[PDB]
Ligand binder design. Sequence first.
Ligand SMILES: c1ccc2c(c1)[nH]c1ccccc12
Ligand SMILES: c1ccc2c(c1)[nH]c1ccccc12
Ligand code: FES
Ligand code: FES
Ligand code: FES
Ligand code: FES
Ligand code: FES
Ligand code: FES
Ligand SMILES: [Fe+2]
Ligand SMILES: [Fe+2]
Ligand SMILES: [Fe+2]
Lengths: 387, 388, 387, 114, 104, 104
Amino acid sequence: ANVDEAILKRVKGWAPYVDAKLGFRNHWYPVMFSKEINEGEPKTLKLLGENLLVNRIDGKLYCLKDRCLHRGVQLSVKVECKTKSTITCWYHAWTYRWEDGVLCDILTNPTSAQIGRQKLKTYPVQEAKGCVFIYLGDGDPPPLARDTPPNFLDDDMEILGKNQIIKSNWRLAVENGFDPSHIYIHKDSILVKDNDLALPLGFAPGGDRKQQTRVVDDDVVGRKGVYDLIGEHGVPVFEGTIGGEVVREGAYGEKIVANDVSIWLPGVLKVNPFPNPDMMQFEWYVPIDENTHYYFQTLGKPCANDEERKKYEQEFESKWKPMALEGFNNDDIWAREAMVDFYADDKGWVNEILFESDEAIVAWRKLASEHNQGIQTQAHVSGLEHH
Amino acid sequence: ANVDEAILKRVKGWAPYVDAKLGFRNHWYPVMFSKEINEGEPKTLKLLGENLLVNRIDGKLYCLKDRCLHRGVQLSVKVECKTKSTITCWYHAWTYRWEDGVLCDILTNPTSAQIGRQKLKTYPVQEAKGCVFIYLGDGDPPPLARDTPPNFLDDDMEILGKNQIIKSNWRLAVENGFDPSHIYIHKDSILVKDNDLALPLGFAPGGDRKQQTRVVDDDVVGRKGVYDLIGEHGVPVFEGTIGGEVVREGAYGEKIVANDVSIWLPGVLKVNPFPNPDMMQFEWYVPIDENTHYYFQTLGKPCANDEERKKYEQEFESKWKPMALEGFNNDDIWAREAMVDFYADDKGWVNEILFESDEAIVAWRKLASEHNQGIQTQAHVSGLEHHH
Amino acid sequence: ANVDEAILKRVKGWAPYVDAKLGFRNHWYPVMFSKEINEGEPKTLKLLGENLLVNRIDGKLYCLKDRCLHRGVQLSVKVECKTKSTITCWYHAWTYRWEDGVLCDILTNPTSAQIGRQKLKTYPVQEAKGCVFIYLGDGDPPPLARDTPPNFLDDDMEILGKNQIIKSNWRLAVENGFDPSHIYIHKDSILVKDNDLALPLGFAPGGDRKQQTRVVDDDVVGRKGVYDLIGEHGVPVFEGTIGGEVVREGAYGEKIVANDVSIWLPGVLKVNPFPNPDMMQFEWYVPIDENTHYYFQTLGKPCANDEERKKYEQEFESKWKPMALEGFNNDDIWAREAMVDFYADDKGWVNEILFESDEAIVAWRKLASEHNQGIQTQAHVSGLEHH
Amino acid sequence: NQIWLKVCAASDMQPGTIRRVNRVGAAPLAVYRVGDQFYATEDTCTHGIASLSEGTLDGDVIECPFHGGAFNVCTGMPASSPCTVPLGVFEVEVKEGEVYVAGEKKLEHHHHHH
Amino acid sequence: IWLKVCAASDMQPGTIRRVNRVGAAPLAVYRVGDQFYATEDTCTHGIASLSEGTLDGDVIECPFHGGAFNVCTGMPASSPCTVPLGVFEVEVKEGEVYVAGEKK
Amino acid sequence: IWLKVCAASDMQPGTIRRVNRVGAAPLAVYRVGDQFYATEDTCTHGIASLSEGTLDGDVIECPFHGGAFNVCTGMPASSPCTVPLGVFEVEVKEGEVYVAGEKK
Ligand SMILES: c1ccc2c(c1)[nH]c1ccccc12
Ligand SMILES: c1ccc2c(c1)[nH]c1ccccc12
Ligand code: FES
Ligand code: FES
Ligand code: FES
Ligand code: FES
Ligand code: FES
Ligand code: FES
Ligand SMILES: [Fe+2]
Ligand SMILES: [Fe+2]
Ligand SMILES: [Fe+2]
């Protein structure tokens, strides 16, 4: 366990989730865009606490753990790729093949018994929609579709996005994103006025608990997620009051967005439609270490031809990226950072005082606890231990 | 439980004090000056490890815990006071009343069953002598006088001061202040010469241990403290010698100051008279967290009217503050910081080698351990825990 | 004491060495050069986690612990030496004699019962070859010769050097220096080309395990060390191959250096001859705290008269220091730093995958574990404990 | 509504069990059987949105399934952190071996003094 | 030379008595069972009075920091005490307690 | 194809015996109760000699890092070991222990 047993014993509905401080192992995760990794130029990154190296050889991507088997140094301190298909540690020259991680040569001692007998950890890598996904897990990987939201992989869906490192645990990011009432922090966003959006301040719940969401565990692709259906029976809040007096109003724009919100394992949100009635937003909160995550944002829009793609790319750069991804989502960044202290000692998972709209978050916590493919532990990071 | 039990078990005479790393709960503490908090202008601060928000509404001060009950964020990240009597969390808009902390509204869900059924922690606050005191405790507060040194509240006593954050635990600050022999670090202060002070280097105690101090626990207002009476039977040291040879002398000025020094719970020192024969110094060492404290300095001088008050203020700014509060006490600051390492791992409370003048400090440690009103713990900060 | 007992239990061949993260107590250690400390000018430093003060009085060096017995403050915060033979704490004026650390006076209370009844810790200090050595131990010290490599103290040996603080535990430094195969990291050193050195990329071991090293359990002066004999029956590797193809070559210079390499307790390497056929290198990796060490480098050369010494000093400053001490050893510095993470959690001591040339390192770890004179503990630093 | 709400037959509940009672236009209640006695409180934990009827009853103390907080079912007073707000208590009576729970909670009104 | 301290019965078993001496440092007389011992009263680690400490067998525990000494040898039994306590042999004749004037 | 190890009587149950081979890597012969087993002597996780380790039942523990192997199957039993050990054929005849030249 990554958390005090006394705390886990208290959280009977989603202890696995509370214990998953380092993220879920055995799932695909996006870490960068295809255009960021060039042929023969190894790139470093940390995923679920593990230092990795990604390289492109003959157009295909390969992933090796960035830690020599010998004395545990990062090969990336001084990259020495002496042949197209290998990488040689700069320290004692142990050489590994990118395709299977096998220790194939040792320049400092070509007669060593370790040659051909040791293997450096490799991870599956797949590119899709111009995004680089890494299967941080063991054994043959499942289809990428299992860990992606519906429609992301659609043939005509043009995907454009942005990625950055944010200082907060991945779970705080997920819950902020799937939070129905957090919409309040976006009330003064430039996207609201500049794109004439209809955006309430909150929601007055309606119907029973079960009706508040739609848990997906019957998806043929294997996807596991939760749909937020708070707006189906609830009354949108457009006039906020204190003591019966109106103190704030929502946005009364013509554009209707975000009437379909869903969270999917391992941790990717889908907002449809957004930021425009003809688009969709898919964003991942990828675990880097217990205190940080990649906020991998993508916006999808159907495009039947290059002209449409170019047109879309142009408006993305000029409007969508700056007005939405940044203009709208920037407040989510410091919002996440604001919850760090309460949950930092793991006590927040016990002392939080939830209200009606959090029923969606609770559904997600239970779904994640029940359907994740594994709990990443520090032991996975240092080296598995067992007697 | 803030300290390793093994260590606490070793300290028979003052374990509670050694355990009070975060300070004593249920006492009044000054945190700022009145003129620093304006109408409808929320101010943040950390006291005894707790993040707090203070605000002035219709002239009156109110204190709310700076932590939303919902997801635990500090309301101060983005302050939202949409009505004069309330504050709305910037996250999901839970709204609380400054007057009682009651969750009175929730803008994102007006039908929520939580409305009116939750209450954010509030703490009593009262201004006195231009100083803002917060009662960091539970239940109805005791009279402010209980936690203030004698005369601080006298009608004619004009109080002026300075406050800052120092990087050392509050106890190191308290002990440095009530330490009879630390006076040695002030031998070269500009105040000594510039104000013609008589200041010895130290003291050769006389009489028994009981005579070294006067433990006060019979005060009518209920204050608890200790007076340092070392110079009552002790020979002040003016000639410092090594191997019998004079290597340093004290100051032979005309002004007699610090006839009596006293320390009082929760942790405020009174030096009388100081820095001038007609003045008094009152200083608090307020716990912010385990490693820091507010060094709340105040100088008091009787004033009969607004003319004298104005005169005193001008003197304070041009002389007293720069020459005394800074020129004299600046050495106390780095002195406190210098003891951090030894006590940081809590080992110093066991390995320290005391000498005669430390009898005063020991008395304080025992008084504090026996009369404090509660030990602040990390659980108070995150949320008290209890299992049936 | 210093490491998780579950880890020490696993390391049966050298548990004490793994436990010695703060270094070995009761050994001499060089900490500075004689010219760095002048008459009546106390100098501060930290050795084996202890804050110390060194002063020169009437030409002789004295060492006192830089921590007042009263309230534990460092005397050095505000030095007050009021008489040639004493130092007075700036706080409450407790006064100590440099000679024996005895508390001889208290200016703030001349009648205190503590006077003459307390003693500040002192450590023996000896100057040799222009270097300042401190015996960080208790009781009467053994001869300095016991803790120095052979010939360092020879009458005609002229010693010149450099010292600096490096961010890595001292053990990582020792192992890197004595590592036969680490020579690979030096393949592009300016010294190799500019001083025409012969330098292989590594060695293909020959002979049996016991022939790989020569352990010296006892010397005339009680020295304890190990000589690296990998080149005795081993084959120098001059061409590195991957998949049978040559991808790198060693240096075919004419000068043969590093005839013999030996490591000695408490942790000093001797490379002879180096960096030139007529000189030798002696370098210490002195523990400062658990994360740093002094990298005390020295180059020695026999000199008969004052003319040769003068010439040598000129050559040192213009060639050897910049081309060897820095041009060659700078790569050792970042190599040491690269191993920090793997061993920081003490798990590297279990997970490392060693190969043949590491027999030298294993021999050192065992010798160190069996012949060290004491394990420094955090308790020695704060104050020994026993109930 | 109705002063007394019919819940079930006293025999339909085993000792140490809990039953949730839904009400039209009002928050749900939870009825507990401690031995041969019956008690009732609001069903919703005062610390959040959990259903106490889905918790675990240990004697006369109900433990919330969300965060482990607990209450005494007889007095409605908190028994374990993080709960701090008292539960509303509803009187229960058995008429003809039939269980009935009050529609209004009890108040510190017209009862024993403190 | 020998000083008359008190009658043996004046001390209950396992208790400690402080003996003040004009112009000299006070002493501590310990009664362990039916045996009597004496040392300097001041802990060698500070200014604490050992007579105000806790006696366990022949070991006196200082009330300040938990340091300890063997009341028979005067040697430290527990840290942080490092300086040996001055020991004074005691004599009990005719139910009367006597403590030597000097150490040893 | 067989090398003479020793007489079965020269090995106490639960003991190990290193078998050095000229111009080849050494082997380890384990005696678990009444049956003998053999594997490479060198631990697959490094350069340690398993014959200098500890035998607990049919599991050999490496002296270097605590990794372990089942001496019958040669499979890793404890971390950090992960690479299977080479197992060799053992044969007892006329009271003498024999080990196969090559692994199975
Ligand atoms: C409700 C309404 C809008 C959004 C949401 C939840 N979550 C989001 C994440 C990214 C962008 C927009 C949204
Ligand atoms: C003894 C004598 C003077 C002082 C003291 C203790 N503590 C002080 C704190 C502030 C100013 C003066 C003093
Ligand atoms: S650490 Fe990579 S080859 Fe030695
Ligand atoms: S964190 Fe304050 S309303 Fe949600
Ligand atoms: S801390 Fe050095 S004399 Fe007091
Ligand atoms: S919702 Fe019941 S303890 Fe939190
Ligand atoms: S004064 Fe006795 S143990 Fe410190
Ligand atoms: S070398 Fe055997 S466990 Fe590492
Ligand atoms: Fe958002
Ligand atoms: Fe001072
Ligand atoms: Fe090197």
